[PDB]
Each structure stands twice: as C-alpha cells, then as structure tokens.
Design a protein around this nucleic acid. Structure first.
Lengths: 502, 54
DNA sequence: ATTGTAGCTGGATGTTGAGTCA
DNA sequence: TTGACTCAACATCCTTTGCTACAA
C-alpha cells in the first residue's frame, strides 16, 4: 500500500530480524577485530617492521622518567609517536580505495540485495596480511593495523581500536535510501580502525590515527575521530569502539569517543535494554583473554569521570530513555519522588523563549506497587504501613500504592507431618516467587506432575504460577505443577518418569 | 551446530574477508533457523567456536 | 438430556517515521 | 541546519480464577 510507505516504517517481524541480525553481524565484526589483533602480534612480521624505526626514535618511545615534570616525558612520548606516524606514511608506498564501503555501516536495503548477487571473493589469508604490511600495499585499514604492528614490535603498548559498524537496528525505515552525492569522500572522512598508546607518565591512553586524519590526540571531552554531521554518520554510526591490546585484552572503549554516550549513543546500542546489556557483556568476556591490570583501573577512573561530566542533555528527546535522568513530565503515574528531593537540573526547551523543564535524577524516583502487585512478588504490607499514592482504575477504583519499605517478605506456613499444604479457596497454592514456596516443600513443574501425585495418593497442592489471559474474555490460572513436601520429591520424580505406566 | 563446510567459510570470511559478511550471514542464517536462538542466548559459545580451529 | 463444549482479553502508555514551523 | 512539536499507526506493557446457549 501507498500509506504503508508514506509512513516509512516496517513490520514488527522486520524489527526483530533487524535486531537479531545486528547482533549476529556485531559478533562477527568483533571476532574479526580479535583475530586481526592476533595477526598484528605476529613474530615473523614483528622483527621485520622493527627495523623501520631508528634508535633515536625508539628512545623517544621509551623516554626516561622525569621527576620534577612528568609532562616533559609525555612530550617525548608524543614526539616518538609523531615520527612514527611519518616514517609509516613513508613505508606505506601504496594506499588503495576501499572496494565497497569497506567496513562502514551498510544499509538494510544494501544487505537484502547483497545476497541476491555474486561477487569476486578475493580471499585474504594470514600470510597475505603479513606480506601486505611488510611491502606497504593495502587499504587504509590494513595500513593502521600494520602501524599498530610496528609499534608493538617496538615494545610500545599499542591497541588496535575498531569501531564496529553493524547495521542500525534502530533504523525502522522500509526505504533506507542514501544520498549519492559526495558519498565516498564523506564515508572515508573518519576511520574505522585506529590506534591507542598508553602514556605511563600521564596515565592516559593516547589516541593515534596515523593514516586517515594523521593526528595524535589526548581525548578529554572531544575527539577528532568521532564522526560529525548527518552526511558522514550515514555510514559511520559510532556506538561500539572496541580496543584490543598486546596481551589479548578487549575493552569497550566507546566512552572515550562518544561526547554523548548516555543520551545519544545508548539509544543506538544493542545495550539499550537489560537483556542486550548482559548479551554484550558476554561477547566482551568471550574476547577478553587476560587478567585485569592497574591500567584497567586508570581507564575506568577516566570513564567514571566522563560519565560524571556528560550531565543533563540539551534536548528533550535525549532525555527520553535516559539511564540517570527523568523529566518531571515523564515520571510515571506509579512513581513518586523520594522524600525531601528536588530536581537535579533544568532543561532549556529549544523553540520557546524561557521555557524550562524540571529534571530529576532517576535514583531519587521511587517505584510503587499495589497490594496485589506486591503479592505477585511474594510480598505483603507491613502492620503500620500507610500508602504513598492513590490512583483511579477501571475493571473507577481507588487503588492504593505502597513503597518497597512498606512491604514485608511473605513467608508461607510449613506443611504438616503428612505433608499437607495449606491452600487457597480454589484448592491450590499460589507460587509466584521462590519465596512463596513453603520452607519444607518443593515446587515440581511438569505437565504430568499433578497426575503423578494423584496416582501416588500422596498429599500435595497444585501450583498456580501465573495467569493466562484470553478467550472471548476473562482470566484463567496457569497450573504449571505441584508443591509437595521435599521428602516426597524423588518419589514424585520417579512417578513422573514412568507416567506411561500410570 | 553447523556443517564443517560452512564453518570453514564463516571462519575464513570473519578473519580475512569481513567485507563479505553481509551475504554469507544472510545465506547461513536462512539455512540455519536455529542459529537465531543460539546467538541470542549463547554468544560466547558461537564466539569460542569461531576461535576454535582458528 | 440438565452435561459437554463452541464461541464471546483491552486501555493506557510507549515508539516509530513524516511532516511542519519558528 | 535544529529540535520541539503533533499526527497517525503500530507495538508493548499490566491485567492476575468464566459465562451463556444450545445440541445431545
């Protein structure tokens, strides 16, 4: 339909496939970085590149410790780095254009169509890579990788830095067309790979792009490598900047390069929700093959301060799903401000003179649940608990809401000697939490666990673990299994095992 | 759980030819419906597997 | 024949892209 | 060139133990 295309959105089926594909693609990219990082460490290659660096220059890379002014040492470090940048330009005698978008972000349309057609699979093996680096023949990616390899062969702590460009799963457009004008020149305006070098004297990582921008910098708030401008970011959405080291580390070094990690960039990572958070953490863990150093501490201290200094964003949409902040206006009806708390900042509303909105820190916001809601977490209200908020709700009903500290942990009574469970009015035990299981019984979840118990004629209770909503209307409870006294568990598990005989 | 044939390519493409990821992933994921759920819950497995025989 | 069964959630809130305007 | 709007069509979250009519 034409209206389907007017509003340029896609199906929920697509949303999920894009989200998954994003993840899949991301993993492969990251694994590519990890393997490439290995290749860099190549000993045959190392001893070759080492020769490209004069004694003088080598000495500048390891300057003597300066007591009175450690800054003078940083200076000497930077100097060696600069000279290294220069002789590398000299060494790299041929740069090629990228063949087709290199490792820059592809659009969905590009990917859908890519499968459809064949291409010339110019195979690259580990040896090829080494031979390329030593002759100085290759595209800008190989170039910096070789440069890293050189620095490591001078025993400098040089990282490979890769900004992974999987496709944007936040892009829900059905039409994902791009501007053809100056498309190449704008894509290569910022690199995908670069280098970081550790300054022991100042205890910060130095950022080195010897190939693309040809600069060395000491990132504080701004980085010359974070792509800027709508045009450029069409193929360079910065969101996963990964750092690989000599000792087969792997750190998410994005924080350094993202001015707005928390508002702008979070929205664009698979990490926006809690599932993705853990998922990503797993991928990192799988690539991090070393124990933690004091350097890791220094970098975390830097990142910690970078989060502190980002502060409240300039725009409303950026304070939409923020990890630390909420707009007064976005405080959910089921929430109140913790006693004796104000906003922690304000937001000048772009478009209206003197229009300003109160901003609260998320940590000063308390979540309230109703009597029932709490019970669905095995929690009941304390004796002398007054509620915090009241809401009108239809099934119009004043439902009272309570804070966590008004609640008490629900402990259910023990089962009798015979294992008799005390049950509700429907003849079951409600079990919504491990807490709701009686402390001398067990929950046995199995389609046939009920049948089994009945067969053994032994004392039990069916478990209402959740509710199913449906049909023309109304609700029906999900009986997922049994609660029985612990000493009957193996008897039950046996019966269950041989149900076909019952 | 993949064929030895595809896993050869996947490893070759990932390490030396990531410019050719797009269609190979497209292809493989269409031929391995299970993979979807595998990646979602066991990424470290797929990772270590890709680094195995590397 | 008086039982066995087929057929009758959803509303409040959140997210996405287009388009417009100051 | 900027974001704060409003629009409109979805999606996702919170709900949290049946009821009537009719064929057999």
């Amino acid at each position: 339909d034409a209206r389907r295309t007017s509003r340029n959105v896609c199906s929920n089926e697509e949303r999920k496939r894009r989200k998954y594909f994003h993840m899949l693609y991301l993993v492969c990219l990251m694994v590519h970085g990890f393997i490439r990082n290995e290749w860099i460490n190549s000993k045959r290659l190392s001893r070759k590149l080492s020769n490209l660096v004069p004694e003088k220059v080598f000495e500048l890379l390891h300057p003597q410790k300066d007591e009175e002014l450690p800054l003078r040492s940083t200076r000497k470090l930077l100097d060696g780095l600069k000279k290294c940048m220069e002789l590398w330009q000299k060494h790299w005698k041929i740069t090629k254009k990228y063949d087709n978008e290199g490792l820059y972000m592809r659009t969905w349309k590009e990917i859908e169509m890519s499968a459809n057609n064949k291409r010339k699979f110019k195979t690259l093996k580990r040896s090829d890579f080494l031979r390329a680096v030593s002759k100085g023949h290759g595209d800008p990616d190989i170039s910096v990788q070789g440069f890293v390899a050189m620095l490591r062969a001078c025993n400098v702590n040089a990282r490979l830095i890769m900004s992974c460009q999987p496709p944007d799963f936040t892009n829900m457009k059905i039409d994902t067309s791009l501007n053809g004008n100056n498309a190449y020149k704008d894509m290569v305006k910022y690199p995908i790979f670069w280098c970081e070098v550790w300054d022991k004297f100042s205890k910060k990582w130095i950022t080195v792009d010897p190939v693309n921008l040809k600069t060395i910098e000491q990132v504080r708030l701004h980085s010359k490598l974070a792509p800027k401008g709508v045009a450029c970011c069409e193929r360079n959405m910065l969101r996963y900047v990964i750092a690989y080291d000599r000792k087969y580390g792997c750190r998410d070094v994005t924080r350094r390069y993202a001015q707005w990690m928390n508002s702008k960039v979070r929205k664009r990572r698979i990490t926006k929700d809690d599932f993705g958070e853990k998922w990503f953490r797993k991928v990192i863990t799988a690539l991090h093959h070393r124990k933690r150093t004091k350097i890791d501490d220094y970098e975390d201290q830097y990142f910690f301060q970078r989060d502190e200094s980002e502060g409240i964003p300039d725009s409303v949409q950026d304070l939409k799903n923020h990890p630390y902040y909420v707009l007064e206006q976005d405080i959910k009806q089921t929430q109140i401000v913790k006693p004796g708390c104000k906003e922690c900042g304000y937001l000048k509303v772009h478009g209206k003179v003197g229009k300003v909105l109160k901003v609260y820190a998320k940590r000063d916001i308390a979540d309230l649940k109703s009597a029932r809601q709490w019970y669905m977490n095995g929690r009941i209200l304390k004796t002398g608990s007054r509620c915090k908020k009241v809401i009108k709700r239809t099934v119009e009903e004043d439902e009272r809401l309570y804070s966590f500290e008004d609640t008490e942990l629900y402990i259910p009574p023990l089962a009798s000697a015979s294992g008799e469970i005390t049950k509700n009015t429907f003849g079951n035990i409600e079990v919504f939490a491990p807490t709701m299981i009686p402390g001398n019984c067990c929950l046995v979840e199995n389609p046939v666990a009920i049948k089994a118990a009945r067969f053994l004629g032994v004392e039990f209770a069916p478990a209402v673990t959740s509710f199913k909503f449906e049909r023309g209307s109304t609700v029906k409870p999900v009986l997922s299994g049994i609660v029985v006294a612990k000493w009957l568990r193996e008897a039950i598990e046996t019966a269950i095992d041989g149900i076909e005989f019952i | 759980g993949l064929t030895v044939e595809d896993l050869l390519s996947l490893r070759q493409v990932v390490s030396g030819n990531p410019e050719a990821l797009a269609p190979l992933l497209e292809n493989i994921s269409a031929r391995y419906p299970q993979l979807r759920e595998h990646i979602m819950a066991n990424p470290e497995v797929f990772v270590s597997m890709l680094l195995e025989a590397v």
